[PDB]
């Protein structure tokens, strides 16, 4: 009941009872909150409610202190002081942005803008409030009870009446009942259990609504610049492979934290693993939000670092299959690879946090709270995809608002920029360089002459809201017969339902733009599917076309992005 004010740190007995996170507010800030919002319940040792029997007055502006008790206007004794007066709320030890965070529903883009432009303590309040709001929203959907089991990978579902049905994609993970976590894909539906189980008829699945823990550590520690490399000991014998990053590795040791913007295929994992070879005695914890980002870092370390000093931390509540070649859960190995949600309480000489566009401020804070390091390196690309914000429906979230790190990279610029793309044919590099990198990305490869674009609106159908464009898939099928080398292409689209249809019609392996991030393929076939804000998002468009090493076929819906593609146009 006694704590510190989330706005000015002043000690107080007051917490806001109307705030979902119940933050400690001092007399000054508590007043400026209750007097400007619908929030009127104030909590101390005892709540600020009228003590008079059977009285329901709980509004602090309608209450007074009579002796050492609280009463409303109808029950106060002659000698009483208002609880709200002179810009203060009574209590021991005697804000426009805080009000908006405290009262918003997190459905507008402006809510996320504020959560990232506010002061550091308000970024944690915002991140805690958003996460709790997202989980209290997880109690709103309807239960799915299995009507029948068709096979080992297919079933029919019976949904709860009155409550909405949640989007059936890999994004939403249900906990089966505890028969393990399970996912779904589209009356026949495809079931994917984390644990193999004889799907009982009648057994139900419900979305995991986990408890949101409070945040203590800032999203970014206060920056410190040094005159010499601190706590790290460089090699003089550094492999020529990593020579291009020596000045940047030295910058890493001369700052508390550093940001690295690495466009697709510019050498982010190479830089991260080369940091270990540059400071050979340094203990490095490699972290990212997803198991896939952590696994890609593991694959790079397997090729350059001693396997006996590596360890992959895997949580006991295993959801997906991940990296198997390092010793598991050895927290004290020199190189620790672990997702943010599974990080142990440890220290390190360097912490490398990869795929930074996918981090939230909640993740940034958790990393600072579990890992106490000499240096923190943030690697990613603000021109790539952010974490899905399930509550956000109105407006688009710009890159400078993804998290604190992305805000810095878009405002003051990143500390380090990898400006040469080694993956993509020049047609793709020239396109994304002009689109999202202010013409600063350069192509290492020549033009492949295997990058094609076709403007074909087709016909848009919908599986609920997830879109399908069968004529765009038909155009691809026609192209494949005439271009058999493309038989080995990966089919990519902004929609899971478009991918499901293309998987059955084309037989190509399938990937959404969002699940393709961090991966690369020789050939990519991309169907835009629709002209929505989702399919036209320039970051999503950037990720989609930079998956290709050799060739890409883009079947476009949007004239704008089609005209921007520096590809050979095709006809049909
Ligand atoms: Zn205060
Ligand atoms: Zn409040
Ligand atoms: Zn009363």
Q: For the purposes of burial, counting CB atoms within 10 Å of the CB of 324, is it exposed (0-12), middle (13-18) or buried (19 or more)?
A: exposed
- Compute the distance from residue 86 Cα to the ligand 1 centre, in Å: 15
| Token pair 């409070």: residue | 214
Ligand-binding site membership of 310 (annotated): no
Which ligand does the CA of 20 lie closest to? 2
- Compute the distance from residue 325 Cα to the ligand 3 centre, in Å: 68
Residues 6 or more apart whose CB falls under 8 angstroms from that of 9 comprise: 121
Q: By three-state DSSP, how is residue 115 classified?
A: helix
Structural tokens at position 163: 């409550």
- Compute the distance from residue 51 Cα to the ligand 2 centre, in Å: 22
Ligand-binding site membership of 289 (annotated): no
- Compute the distance from residue 438 Cα to the ligand 2 centre, in Å: 42
What's the CA gap between 100 and 109, in Å, rounded? 13
- Compute the distance from residue 132 Cα to the ligand 1 centre, in Å: 23
The resolution in Å comes to 1.9
What's the CA gap between 456 and 35, in Å, rounded? 56
Which ligand does the CA of 22 lie closest to? 2
Q: What are the beta bridge partners of residue 451?
A: 552
Ligand-binding site membership of 27 (annotated): no
What's the CA gap between 327 and 342, in Å, rounded? 16
Ligand-binding site membership of 84 (annotated): no
Which ligand does the CA of 35 lie closest to? 2
Ligand-binding site membership of 421 (annotated): no
Contact 568, 452 (CB under 8 A): yes
Q: What kind of experiment solved this structure?
A: X-ray
- Compute the distance from residue 84 Cα to the ligand 3 centre, in Å: 16
- Compute the distance from residue 99 Cα to the ligand 2 centre, in Å: 7
Instruction: Give the number of other Cβ atoms within 10 Å of residue 487's Cβ.
Output: 12
Ligand-binding site membership of 406 (annotated): no
- Compute the distance from residue 22 Cα to the ligand 2 centre, in Å: 7
| DSSP for residue 5 | -
Which ligand does the CA of 94 lie closest to? 1
Instruction: Give the number of other Cβ atoms within 10 Å of residue 63's Cβ.
Output: 27
Q: By three-state DSSP, how is residue 183 classified?
A: strand
CA distances (Å), origin 376, targets 220, 243, 257, 287, 305: 9, 21, 4, 11, 20
Ligand-binding site membership of 424 (annotated): no
Taking a 5 Å cut-off on Cβ, the residues next to ion ligand 1 are: 5, 7-8, 10, 26, 29
What's the CA gap between 315 and 289, in Å, rounded? 13
| DSSP for residue 489 | P
Contact 293, 354 (CB under 8 A): yes
- Compute the distance from residue 35 Cα to the ligand 2 centre, in Å: 11
Residues 6 or more apart whose CB falls under 8 angstroms from that of 497 comprise: 186, 462, 463, 466, 467, 468
Structural tokens at position 278: 């540059």
Which ligand does the CA of 103 lie closest to? 2
- Compute the distance from residue 80 Cα to the ligand 3 centre, in Å: 13
What's the CA gap between 314 and 329, in Å, rounded? 6
Residues 6 or more apart whose CB falls under 8 angstroms from that of 128 comprise: 21, 212, 214, 215, 362
Ligand-binding site membership of 33 (annotated): yes
Report the run of H or E that residue 367 belongs to, with start and end. helix 361-370
Which ligand does the CA of 63 lie closest to? 3
What's the CA gap between 15 and 17, in Å, rounded? 6
Structural tokens at position 454: 């076709």
Please give the CATH number for the structural domain made up of 421-564.
3.40.50.300
Which ligand does the CA of 69 lie closest to? 3
Contact 252, 284 (CB under 8 A): no
- Compute the distance from residue 457 Cα to the ligand 2 centre, in Å: 49
* Phi–psi pair at 159, nearest 5 degrees: -95, 150
Which ligand does the CA of 55 lie closest to? 3
What is the pairing mode between strands 346-353 and 284-288? parallel
Q: What are the beta bridge partners of residue 286?
A: 337, 352
Ligand-binding site membership of 551 (annotated): no
- Compute the distance from residue 68 Cα to the ligand 3 centre, in Å: 15
Ligand-binding site membership of 118 (annotated): no
Ligand-binding site membership of 30 (annotated): no
Which ligand does the CA of 24 lie closest to? 1
Please state at what angle helix 361-370 crosses helix 120-137, rounded to 10 degrees: 110
Which ligand does the CA of 62 lie closest to? 3
Which ligand does the CA of 26 lie closest to? 1
- Compute the distance from residue 99 Cα to the ligand 3 centre, in Å: 27
CA distances (Å), origin 436, targets 121, 240, 422, 433: 31, 31, 17, 6
| DSSP for residue 332 | T
Contact 319, 299 (CB under 8 A): no
Ligand-binding site membership of 262 (annotated): yes
Report the run of H or E that residue 471 belongs to, with start and end. helix 470-482
- Compute the distance from residue 49 Cα to the ligand 3 centre, in Å: 8
- Compute the distance from residue 168 Cα to the ligand 1 centre, in Å: 44
- Compute the distance from residue 20 Cα to the ligand 2 centre, in Å: 8
Residues 6 or more apart whose CB falls under 8 angstroms from that of 57 comprise: 49, 50, 63, 72, 74, 75
Instruction: Give the number of other Cβ atoms within 10 Å of residue 168's Cβ.
Output: 21
What's the CA gap between 299 and 294, in Å, rounded? 9
- Compute the distance from residue 60 Cα to the ligand 3 centre, in Å: 12
């Amino acid at each position: 009941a006694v704590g510190a004010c989330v706005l000015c740190n002043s000690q107080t007995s007051l917490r806001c009872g109307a705030c979902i996170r119940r933050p400690f507010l001092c007399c000054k800030c508590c007043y400026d909150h209750v007097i400007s919002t619908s929030h009127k319940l104030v909590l101390s040792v005892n709540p600020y409610v009228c003590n008079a029997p059977g009285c329901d007055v709980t509004d602090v502006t309608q209450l007074y202190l009579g002796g050492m008790s609280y009463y409303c206007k109808s029950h106060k004794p002659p000698i009483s002081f208002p609880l709200c007066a002179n810009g203060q709320v009574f209590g021991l030890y005697k804000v426009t942005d805080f009000n908006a965070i405290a009262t918003c529903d997190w459905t507008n883009a402006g809510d996320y803008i504020l959560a990232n432009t506010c002061t550091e303590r308000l970024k944690l309040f915002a991140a805690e409030t958003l996460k709790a709001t997202e989980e209290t929203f997880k109690l709103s959907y309807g239960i799915a009870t299995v009507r029948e089991v068709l096979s080992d990978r297919e079933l029919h579902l019976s949904w709860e009446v009155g409550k909405p049905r949640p989007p059936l994609n890999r994004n939403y993970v249900f906990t089966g009942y505890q028969i393990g976590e399970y996912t779904f894909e589209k009356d026949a539906v495809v079931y994917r259990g984390t644990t193999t189980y004889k799907l009982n008829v009648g057994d139900y699945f419900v979305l995991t609504s986990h408890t949101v823990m409070p945040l203590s550590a800032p999203t970014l520690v206060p920056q410190e610049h040094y005159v010499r490399i601190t706590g790290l000991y460089p090699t003089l014998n550094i492999s020529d492979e990593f020579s291009s990053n020596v000045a940047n590795y030295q910058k890493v040791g001369m700052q508390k934290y550093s940001t690295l913007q690495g466009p697709p295929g510019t050498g982010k994992s190479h830089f991260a693993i080369g940091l270990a070879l540059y400071y050979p005695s340094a203990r490095i914890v490699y972290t990212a939000c997803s198991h896939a980002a952590v696994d890609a870092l593991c694959e790079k370390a397997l090729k350059y670092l001693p396997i006996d000093k590596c360890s992959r931390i895997i949580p006991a509540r295993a959801r997906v299959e991940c990296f198997d070649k390092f010793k598991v859960n050895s927290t004290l190995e020199q190189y620790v690879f672990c997702t943010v949600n599974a990080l142990p309480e440890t220290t390190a000489d360097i912490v490398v946090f990869d795929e930074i566009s996918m981090a939230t401020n909640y993740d940034l804070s958790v990393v600072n709270a579990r890992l106490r390091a000499k240096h923190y390196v943030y690697i990613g690309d603000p021109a790539q995809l952010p974490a899905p914000r399930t509550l956000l429906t109105k407006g688009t979230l710009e890159p400078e608002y993804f998290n604190s790190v992305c805000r810095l990279m878009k405002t003051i610029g990143p500390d380090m920029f990898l400006g040469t793309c080694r993956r993509c044919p020049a047609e793709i590099v020239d396109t994304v360089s002009a689109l999202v990198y202010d013409n600063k990305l350069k192509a290492h490869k020549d033009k492949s002459a295997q990058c094609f674009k076709m403007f074909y609106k087709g016909v848009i159908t919908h599986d609920v809201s997830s879109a399908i464009n069968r004529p765009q898939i038909g155009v691809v099928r026609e192209f494949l017969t005439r271009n058999p080398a493309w038989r080995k292409a990966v089919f990519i689209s902004p929609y899971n339902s478009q991918n499901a249809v293309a998987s059955k019609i084309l037989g190509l392996p399938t990937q959404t733009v969002d699940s393709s991030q961090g991966s690369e393929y020789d050939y990519v076939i991309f169907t835009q599917t629709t002209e929505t804000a989702h399919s036209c998002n320039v970051n999503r468009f950037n990720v989609a076309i930079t998956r290709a090493k050799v060739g890409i076929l883009c079947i476009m819906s949007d004239r704008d992005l089609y005209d921007k593609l520096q590809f050979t146009s095709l006809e049909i």
